[PDB]
Design a protein around this ligand. Structure first.
Ligand SMILES: C=CCCCCCCCCCC(C)=O
Ligand SMILES: C=CCCCCCCCCCC(C)=O
Lengths: 259, 258
């Protein structure tokens, strides 16, 4: 008995809706509804990084989408890494519209390990890594304005287990990420047990993730326990690129279990 | 093995991203490749309304061509609408191009000009299936931009390509400013001494469109190239449906016109 479901996919830093193309295809092909979103200044979003210094505007595309969702319609919300922040806010704001939330190697802050804590730890693994660089559109007196992912950083830390053509796709598509202030992030993402915590949650681990160490990972899982943790072996950070079929079946299974 | 430099130019709605399979094959084989985004294409910062003049659309390529030291020749590949862009580049920097390749591209010449090839190309897209136009200059002025619908992409463009590539494109196609024939005709002027001096190869690649193939045959007849090659089983986006074949063809062309 087929039950049509609605998957909503949220990308990580530098990326956009385009990174899910293999997953979007498998979904639409099986009869499910899927929405892959471009966050602020991501993918083909019209905004430029410098134009959106407020974290609020980076998340607006998902919040607007969440608000426009029809009555009584539930979705399986999936966030990849940094996208974890975006969906956490969506969970806190519209808990009743989310069947189950999935954190794919996602930043999963909780009441006992706030957003800024997770953002600082995350920042350390990206800033200064290989050829990644920052800009100073506001002068040396102020914090760097944006972060730009380098091709070597992508090939080594993110796409090391993915098809080489996927690496080429990424280099031609990744955009700068405005370096949002922790203070601003801390005010936008505030989670409570009664709302955020009432949403079924599952975390997916990428066994060969070289972008986000398992140390930091186990920390979030331990300090903000999900309803379940699943693994995907042989996957690098971008599971949707390196292990698409496995991620797809894992998502259908998760969808079925929490419907 | 002589290292070479391939410069790829996309067609309407697309961007440098559509060449990802070809770009991957060239880098791994040792060659250098540049996949550019034209104005308001791919991740180019401009929005269609900001580039109402065709010159604005071509700027990323003209700009790239100028930065090239005359001694570093390239193989310039233009796809479909991209044919107009490389034609302009052929006229301005003729000596920097070893050979110019038109992948089912618009190939205007002295006998069949830019406005002619354009009007024809546009009739195959405007009003087709779920495509639509916008009016940012008011309801009384001609439409400003053309947007590619997903059904049109599935049926008329990616019909012979992997389903994921259709999904990829639906997530990345951007609007195209509806340039004026008058602007285009004035921007794309070609002369036998410059444009005509560049080695030119046309690649035929289309499958279930007799009229499309006819139009393509009309340009080859009116503006004869130095050679015509063919690729079978390709839909509109050969780089998606027949990657390995397109790649092989490009290397062959490159090794022959050093
Ligand atoms: C505190 C500054 C905000 C910037 C957030 C940096 C963290 C991004 C983590 C995701 C890494 C990736 C390649 O997906
Ligand atoms: C004078 C009209 C110029 C605008 C014509 C736009 C149509 C694009 C045709 C090329 C087909 C394609 C997208 O590959």
């Amino acid at each position: 008995p087929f039950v049509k479901k609605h998957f909503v996919l949220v990308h990580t830093a530098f990326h956009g809706a385009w990174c899910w193309y293999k997953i979007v295809a498998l979904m639409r092909s099986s009869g499910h509804n899927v929405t892959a979103l471009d966050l602020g200044a991501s993918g083909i979003n019209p905004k430029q990084a410098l134009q959106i210094p407020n974290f609020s505007d980076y998340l607006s595309p998902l919040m607007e989408f969440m608000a426009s969702l029809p009555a009584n319609e539930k979705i399986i919300l999936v966030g990849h890494a940094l996208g974890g922040l975006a969906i956490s806010k969506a969970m806190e704001t519209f808990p009743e519209k989310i069947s189950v939330a999935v954190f794919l190697s996602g930043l999963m802050p909780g009441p006992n390990i706030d957003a800024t804590t997770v953002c600082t730890k995350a920042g350390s693994a990206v800033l200064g890594q290989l050829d990644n660089c920052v800009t100073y559109e506001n002068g040396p007196t102020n914090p760097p304005t944006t972060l730009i992912a380098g091709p070597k950083f992508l090939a080594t830390n993110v796409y090391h287990l993915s098809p080489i053509e996927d690496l080429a796709l990424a280099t031609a598509l990744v955009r700068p990420l405005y370096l949002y202030l922790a203070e601003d992030i801390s005010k936008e993402v505030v989670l409570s047990s009664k709302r955020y915590g009432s949403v079924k949650r599952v975390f997916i681990v990428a066994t060969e993730n070289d972008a986000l160490k398992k140390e930091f990972l186990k920390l979030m899982i331990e300090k903000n326990p999900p309803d379940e943790v699943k693994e995907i072996e042989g996957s690098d950070h971008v599971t949707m690129m390196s292990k698409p079929q496995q991620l797809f079946t894992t998502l259908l299974s998760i969808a079925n279990k929490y419907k």
